[PDB]
Design a binder for these strands. Structure first.
Ligand SMILES: [Mg+2]
Ligand SMILES: [Mg+2]
Ligand SMILES: [Mg+2]
Ligand SMILES: [Mg+2]
Ligand SMILES: [Mg+2]
Ligand SMILES: [Mg+2]
Ligand SMILES: [Mg+2]
Ligand SMILES: [Mg+2]
Ligand SMILES: [Mg+2]
Ligand SMILES: [Mg+2]
Ligand SMILES: [Zn+2]
Lengths: 5, 209, 142, 176, 38
RNA sequence: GUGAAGAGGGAAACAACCCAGACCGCCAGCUAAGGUCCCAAAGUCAUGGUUAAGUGGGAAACGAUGUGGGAAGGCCCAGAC
RNA sequence: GAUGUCGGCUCAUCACAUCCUGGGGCUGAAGUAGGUCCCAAGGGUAUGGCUGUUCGCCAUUUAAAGUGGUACGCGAGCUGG
RNA sequence: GCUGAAAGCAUCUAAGCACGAAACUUGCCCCGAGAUGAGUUCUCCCUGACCCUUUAAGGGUCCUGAAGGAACGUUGAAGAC
């Protein structure tokens, strides 16, 4: 699970 | 110009009075017998089919035996064809020896290269290997990226990938004729040629001139 | 009652020979396509090939109006990236003259299995003689 | 179409034949022939060749004048061979004639050999000048251009192959 | 030769000619004046 | 005004544009927009012209003895250009 | 009711507004070497120091170390500064 | 560039000719007749009885089993199989 803040 | 079919005996070194060492491939070119002649009126092109060597008559098939009997020739290892120039002419059953190259300085040698089997991209296409350390995970010599995302959305034809290597027809051009020895049916050509020892070999005068 | 429909194994087919010398490419092609599809027959059926066999002679002697004898470019892709190829009308005539007639007629025939079957009846020759004398084709003045 | 209107005279010693569009001219200096186009009409009903536009062709008038001009020179060629004179300018520029071949030295590292057309003849009165004689105006002019093309006259010194009547505009080199 | 959209005579000797569908100027008085439309 | 809540034909494909409002059935006819050489139903239709650029089937200022038509003017068989 | 970032690595592919090589016109082009413009995309089109950097500067090379598109190409291929 | 009118001159162009680049088509190397448009050439093999009706590129029994292939075995500088 990647994140894009 | 017409060529002949020989066998790769191996590799050998030739010394010279001046002190130079010439690496030469020893090619055995026995008597090449003409089994059939191709004529424009009947075949649409001018060429000669020749056979070399001999094979056990037990394993010769009936259709193969009948063809050789037509030209009055003994069955050889196989059959090869050479295209004829304007002035060249031959007759069925004629024997051609290695003396044809007596006046030839450069030759073209073709044969089946050594079979490497299934080869990876690094060996097959000289792909650069990725880092062996610095965090690399199971990707030390994998091909890597093979495309450009959505726009093409596919892999282009001819992309270099792992697959069969070698075991294919290969030609080496402009090999010097070091020596022609008719008394032993031998032809010494500088440098290496495709294929392993004992493999079928085709020698032609250098088309590149 | 039921409207008549042509039956593929009952169609009667006859052979024709057409001299392409001096005929414009496009206007000759339309007639060939019309004959190949069978639109000239009163028994025309869209789903049945009711056309005739046409032999084209002197395929290298077809004329093109205007300057398109050199500006007419034929494009085809080899399937490999960057494999776009060009060949002007003059080059096509020099290399394979019967391609121009076949390409023009092919683009005017229907598309699909039936259309390809229609094209198989077209037989184009670059020279003035053909080997289909056994079919005793009738001269067609297109 | 003033040129087209002017007729072309064929004096004694010149034989002309018209077979459809191809018109042939014969004379003492040789033989010439060309194929005229359909848009031009030529007649030989008298001692002079008359030209006019064929009906239905838009370019008849303009192209008719061209036919008259070529045949006027065509008749002149068979009666008097056209002559072209070239001059060689250079420190060591020389020319030689071996017959149908001309040998020139123009400062190159290799010899220059030119093959004349079958209908052209060349003479070299001086090593620095070559004179060409021929029957058809087209080839002789083309041959002269080919020889001139080997080394065109340099703007700064005028050296090279030039026509005898050519004028070369010499330009002075940038000072300092 | 200078290629530009505006091709015009530059002196009394310049002449405008059409060769292959291109308007170009040829001057026998000065090579600088020769132009082509492009 | 249409779509939304609207199918059908046309614009190659293309809710909103053009024509036109589908109760059901027919292997009948006439038309709209748009079209009539072939893919592909209908004119390789009849007259008088224009274009040579495949313009038509993308783009300006500006540039050019391209070519057609129209009304005037200077010069000219006292010899013009 | 998810289309994972910058840079590097690997592997690329196309455009031509061309960096080198090739062919030309002018030049205030003597030659050598350049300037500018036109045609040309076939091939080729650096390694290092610093910085996570692209970039940039610097060192030393090269015939040249081109400019761009491809999810500012490429993490179900690697890396994670 | 040659010749050359339209436009008496001039003009590489409108008719007609010549030259011109690593681009283009060939030349060199490899695959290639599933090229269903399935091509060409040279050899080799098979020269028996009958029976039935839905009597036609028909089905079936008996005799026959060719050229050649495959399988199996010993294996290869051929190969994942
Ligand atoms: Mg892990
Ligand atoms: Mg590892
Ligand atoms: Mg990805
Ligand atoms: Mg797609
Ligand atoms: Mg709603
Ligand atoms: Mg989702
Ligand atoms: Mg090439
Ligand atoms: Mg750097
Ligand atoms: Mg990206
Ligand atoms: Mg971090
Ligand atoms: Zn000027």
């Amino acid at each position: 699970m990647f994140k894009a803040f | 110009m017409i060529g002949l079919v020989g066998k790769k005996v191996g590799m050998t070194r030739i010394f010279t009075e001046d002190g130079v060492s010439i690496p030469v491939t020893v090619i055995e070119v026995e008597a090449n017998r003409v089994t059939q002649v191709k004529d424009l009126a009947n075949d649409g092109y001018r060429a000669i089919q020749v056979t070399t060597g001999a094979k056990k008559a037990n394993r010769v098939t009936k259709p193969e035996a009948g063809h050789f009997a037509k030209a009055g020739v003994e069955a050889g290892r196989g059959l090869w064809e050479f295209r004829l120039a304007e002035g060249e002419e031959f007759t069925v059953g004629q024997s051609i020896s290695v003396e044809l190259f007596a006046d030839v300085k450069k030759v073209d040698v073709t044969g089946t290269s050594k079979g490497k089997g299934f080869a990876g991209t690094v060996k097959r296409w000289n792909f650069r290997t990725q880092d062996a350390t610095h965090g690399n995970s199971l990707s030390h010599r994998v091909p890597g990226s093979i495309g450009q995302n959505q726009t093409p959305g596919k892999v282009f034809k001819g992309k270099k990938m792992a697959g069969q290597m070698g075991n294919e027809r290969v030609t080496v051009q402009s090999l010097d004729v070091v020596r022609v020895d008719a008394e032993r049916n031998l032809l010494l050509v500088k440098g290496a040629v495709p294929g392993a020892t004992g493999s079928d070999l085709i020698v032609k005068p250098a088309v590149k001139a | 009652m039921k409207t008549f429909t042509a039956k593929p194994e009952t169609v009667k087919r006859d052979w024709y020979v057409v001299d392409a010398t001096g005929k414009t490419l496009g206007r000759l092609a339309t007639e060939l396509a019309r004959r190949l599809r069978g639109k000239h027959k009163a028994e025309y059926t869209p789903h049945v090939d009711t056309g005739d066999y046409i032999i084209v002679l002197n395929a290298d002697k077809v004329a093109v109006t205007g300057n398109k004898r050199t500006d007419k470019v034929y494009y085809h892709h080899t399937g490999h990236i960057g494999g776009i190829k060009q060949a002007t009308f003059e080059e096509m005539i020099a290399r394979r003259p019967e391609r121009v007639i076949e390409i023009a007629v092919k683009g005017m025939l229907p598309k699909g299995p039936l259309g390809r079957a229609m094209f198989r009846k077209l037989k184009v020759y670059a020279g003035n003689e053909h080997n289909h004398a056994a079919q005793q084709p009738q001269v067609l003045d297109i | 179409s003033r040129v087209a209107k002017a007729p072309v005279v064929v004096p004694a010693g010149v034989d002309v034949k018209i077979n459809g569009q191809v018109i042939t001219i014969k004379g003492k200096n040789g033989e010439l022939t060309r194929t005229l186009n359909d848009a031009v009409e030529v007649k030989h009903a008298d001692n002079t060749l008359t030209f006019g536009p064929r009906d239905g062709y838009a370019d008849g008038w303009a192209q008719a004048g061209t036919a008259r001009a070529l045949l006027n020179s065509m008749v002149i060629g068979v009666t008097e061979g056209f002559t072209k004179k070239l001059q060689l300018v250079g420190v060591g520029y020389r020319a030689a004639v071996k017959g149908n071949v001309i040998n020139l030295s123009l400062g190159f590292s290799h010899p220059v050999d030119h093959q004349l057309p079958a209908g052209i003849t060349a003479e070299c009165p001086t090593q620095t000048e070559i004179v060409l004689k021929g029957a058809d105006k087209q080839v002789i002019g083309q041959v002269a251009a080919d020889l001139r093309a080997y080394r065109r006259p340099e703007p700064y010194k005028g050296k090279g192959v030039r026509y005898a009547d050519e004028v070369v505009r010499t330009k002075e080199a940038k000072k300092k | 030769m200078k290629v530009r959209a505006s091709v015009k005579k530059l002196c009394r000797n310049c002449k405008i000619v059409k060769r292959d569908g291109v308007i170009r100027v040829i001057c026998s008085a000065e090579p600088k004046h020769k132009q082509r439309q492009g």
